[PDB]
Symmetry: D2
Subunit: 375 residues, 4 copies
């Protein structure tokens, strides 16, 4: 009976062996390739699309996509472990990857035609083609609209804060159309009326490239609309999948913060003694450990529930709210101990925590589910 400060509940022992190598894969990749890049990349907001090629080579894009389509046919827990390990380096990297996996690949696999699945998935899976997701507009009821035309759609609108957009080959875009239903459309790079100007001067997620998608009478052929989804269900299946992945990821960022802070305090001294000798510092460390340890249990359990089909979408709201909130708290706690990879993790998480608005959308999904009553 031996104590592991860094893994108190021996998560290692709760993973399948299959799951444990996915994790180490993602780990070796993130540490070997992303850690040496991240500092200058964050600092200068530098576009590097190498992550796609690289991650695609080792089978980490579209983790839940079947082998039939070039995916690695893994389960949800593996998806989670992958995101955890990448965010352990940087939220911006994780972000790029959850765009490929949850925001582009998943809607094509789930909602697309045979022909669409065959054309896009395999190249997405290898990261030869990079994808982006256009739902968000400038300040789920969009004005971006598709109208029917000769064979057969024309899109006009704007989508703001689209990660990958300026380098994307493939575009999953959501617009209204009637016979008013929200629909998903597949556009490709270099297409008439489609542009994607980059955004610079970000405070957080500076290691990912972000842009808009500007659609000025952009022509989508009939064969490019997602056949098997209409309405909220489409965007929502995508966000639900991504929020799951962000819930594991945020914990990775938090672990980094905890380790850096722990190591900092071991190594530096005050009044002839390490900071670690300090009770206040020990309390803070105790809380980081605790919140992270519990969070991991929550996401592990949600992942198992997804895999066996026993998980309602509302669970994802618990884990995503919690994971981001506590990761943010932990980063701030770690920051106020130092006298700086932590500062990076901190502004990242500041963006990540408020991404889905400022009125705590998940607290409400959950309030409504407990009470029956909408806020």
């Amino acid at each position: 009976a031996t104590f592991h400060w860094d893994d108190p509940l021996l998560l290692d022992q709760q993973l399948a062996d299959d799951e444990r190598m996915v994790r180490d894969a993602a780990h070796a990749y993130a540490q070997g390739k992303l850690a040496p890049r991240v500092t200058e990349a964050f600092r200068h907001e530098t576009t590097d699309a190498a992550i796609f090629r690289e991650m695609g080579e080792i089978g980490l894009l579209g983790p839940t996509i079947p082998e039939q389509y070039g995916g690695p046919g893994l389960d949800y827990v593996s998806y989670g472990l992958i995101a955890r390990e990448v965010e352990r380096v940087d939220s911006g990297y994780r972000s790029m990857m959850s765009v490929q996996s949850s925001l582009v690949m998943v809607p094509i696999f789930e909602f697309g035609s045979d022909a669409q699945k065959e054309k896009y998935l395999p190249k997405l899976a290898t990261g030869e083609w990079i994808g982006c997701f256009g739902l968000t507009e400038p300040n789920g009821s969009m004005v971006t609209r598709a109208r029917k035309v000769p064979g057969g759609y024309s899109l006009s609108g704007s989508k703001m804060w689209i990660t990958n957009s300026p380098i994307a080959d493939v575009f999953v875009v959501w617009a209204k159309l009637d016979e008013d239903e929200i629909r998903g459309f597949i556009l490709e790079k270099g297409c008439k009326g489609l542009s994607a100007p980059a955004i610079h001067g970000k405070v957080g997620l500076r290691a990912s490239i972000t842009g808009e998608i500007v659609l000025d009478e952009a022509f989508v052929p009939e064969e490019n609309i997602l056949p098997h989804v209409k309405g909220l269900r489409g965007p929502f299946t995508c966000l639900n999948s991504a929020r799951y992945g962000i819930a594991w990821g945020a914990l990775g960022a938090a672990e980094s913060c905890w380790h850096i802070a722990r190591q900092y305090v071991l190594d530096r001294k005050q009044f002839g003694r390490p900071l670690a000798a300090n009770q206040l510092i020990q309390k803070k460390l105790a809380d980081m450990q605790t919140e992270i340890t519990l969070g991991l249990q929550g996401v592990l359990r949600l992942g198992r529930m997804k895999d066996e089909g026993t998980a309602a979408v509302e669970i994802t709201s618990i884990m995503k709210r919690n994971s981001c909130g506590k990761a943010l708290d932990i980063a701030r706690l770690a920051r106020d101990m130092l006298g700086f990879g932590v500062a990076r993790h901190l502004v990242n998480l500041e963006v990540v925590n408020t991404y889905e608005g400022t009125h705590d959308i998940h607290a409400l999904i959950l309030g409504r589910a407990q009470t029956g009553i909408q806020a």
Copy 2:
């Protein structure tokens, strides 16, 4: 796949049918026998000794103690489940039970002689014998209750304070320093009701845990036969092994109390109206219920996992610190959150919360666990 707001992670489906049965049985007893008693018992600080035989005859005392000695020989997860169903009603009753199991029966089963084990456990198991634990003094290693050697055994003088069960106890597990082979070490002694120089006056007018009887143990040259000393333990390890067992039970029990305050809070916001709309429609009210659900759900995954690890023998003692500190701290936050949601002033049943609140303020004092964790993380002691 259906959402279960009251069990989001389907804890119910993470259990063996085995443990599920023990849970339901604990629940039926708590709700059928302890719920009716609780309001008056708490308001009037009433002594109900009859509770131990009730708990005992259905195998709630000494969950983990083997059948050889009258226990049900259940695993740690079952013990947890039992603690949680009882505290769901009141921390004071849980206190009664956690003392019997972890602080009386455990040191005996674990440290005592074969004669001691057969003498004491079976009666402690059925509840015929009420036990208690004498460790806290008026003002751990700096203990002052003294055992000195005499013909026929030992003679103990000293005082213990805040000992739950003592005024109604038949059996007393008492920790005292015995200087021997030179060496001054902590030893355990079993005493019995009626023994000369042992008195257990009761303490009344408690602020919390009023449904549970507490008093003192006053040792005045009380005679303990040489066959009433715990043969197999010396020093900190004795008292510690017991508290560690108790903290595990408390880590589960506290979550039951938090579930009640949550459940009460939720019902209250449904039934109340404000500005025509029910209280449930307010955004701030929904944050608070979300926070409550979150912390409870996660705290449960925490104690379940620790349970599995103890049954596997893979759990280190430090893990208990995290779970006890988290369960008690988060349950005390939830009680304060639910208490602040009620307007008015204690007439209503939904001021069951006020009782849970004050209980949880005692339990949270029975920071040190942060220090255990900080030390484990760093290798430097800061106590």
Copy 3:
């Protein structure tokens, strides 16, 4: 220059000497007469009416009421200092005195006829007559005055009225019809005249040391000469509340000082690992937070008091101080309760704690003061 840990900003020296003697008189009275009573009174929810004569005797009832009506003619700073000294012992008691001064004497003084003033204030000032105040029910109030022969008939029920079961004088706010138009008017009523009931409330979780009841109006008759003539609508009730709130703001800070002091003496006295608890860094941060919040909270009510004496204080300022004093007293009592072991004398803290939980939730659980303040900042009613 020395440091007074118990009064870092030397509030003692920001007071005028007359103000200090007012403070010491309340402190002598509270430590003398209330301190010995409090545990049992709380423990057993007693009625103690004798406190009103006691406070009236030495002129602490309705401090700002002029001598011309039996008041001591003090300012708002002394009102505060008194409320602070009483609550230092117990919130329940401060409340009794709050009701008498802000919720009965003030309305009569600002809104009553000369006759009303001479009939009621002197007796309230001595404590001969005890008062209460009915506003809150189980703008959109439903308690009602019918105009009838010779005056009014009042019907409805007010709840949670401290002093009500032992009150001699009642100030009720009911709505009255005026040629179609409905407006809030204040009425004085006396004990025992037919139609009025004062049934106590029992088994309270906090403020147990203060007797509390309903007011029950079933067609209770009020004469014409008993309607408050010089106010209608919001001004009446609000002028009262805005005065009680000011005293509660000073009071809460008195309760918080008790918790602080008790906590500090408790950790100096208790030993763990052969050193006082006061030696731990986690303990010292908590004590620093208590010292800070109280010191700042005090500078705020002082400035409020002085602005009130100068007629420069806007009504919204009171919302700042009330919310802050109470909210921060609750935190401090919680921080102090969490530093103590044992399970009930240092346990004045448990008492303060449960008092401050009622006080902090008394005006609702929607944080009415944040809204007042948010509306004043942004212009927007939430």
Copy 4:
């Protein structure tokens, strides 16, 4: 009924003497006029500018408590605070540059220096013609940096790290052990043995320049040792003065974050209303206004006390901890009210990172206050 000022609930403005109010407006006109337009690029590219010293010197805002006699503007502590607050309202880096001159340079020359040193350094420090720095921190401790007697003065050897102003400073106030007490010395730029290497890539306080003071047998003349101080009393008096200014400044930053958050929820709509209409936003706004209003009274009261000589050193711990900690809370609260990522409102992201650093120079104040309350020391 009197008028409510949401932005000055307790009418701080009214509590101020005539001259005090005038200084406030002076520093405000300067900060809004000269510093505001520079701050976004200065912070972004960590773009050193130093014309500020000479700018603030010219309107008499450097070394506020130094008497007119020595070229100072001869003002009280409240005025010092108000200045710090108007500058920090714009950026903590700028206040920091100004805190070093006033508190960490001109104060010790005035308190502990000879008539000669007072006549020579202060008039040019006051106008911002000479720029000062303060070398105390080492990579006290106790400090290692040592001074040694040599013909007609002292030879100094050692190192100071994280010295703000150092790579641009004309005058150095350095603390060394002399055999064995700590003393302060006035070094001049161009002294042999004095190197001041710059440091780049900070997270916060990016508007200010920081560097080292590497000393290698540096020669100080006899007439450049502070004759009137020995031991901790020297450094501590400087720090204690700087903390007082930091106490006001941090509330200036807290004010900006508050006003920015406020204006932001006015401007943005959600669900058909301004965000300012949400109950929870109102609570946050209330907290911001409460903590700022109360902190302002505390530092004002501390100002009056320091003026009248009744303020113990510990009160400064109270205010500095309160001001920095509450400022940071407020900047975190504002930051969290903002969606988006990188326009005007993200002036908040700047103030937050500044306050993160400012807050992190010294909890140590929690323990100063714990010991004064309990008689027991818990630093080590």
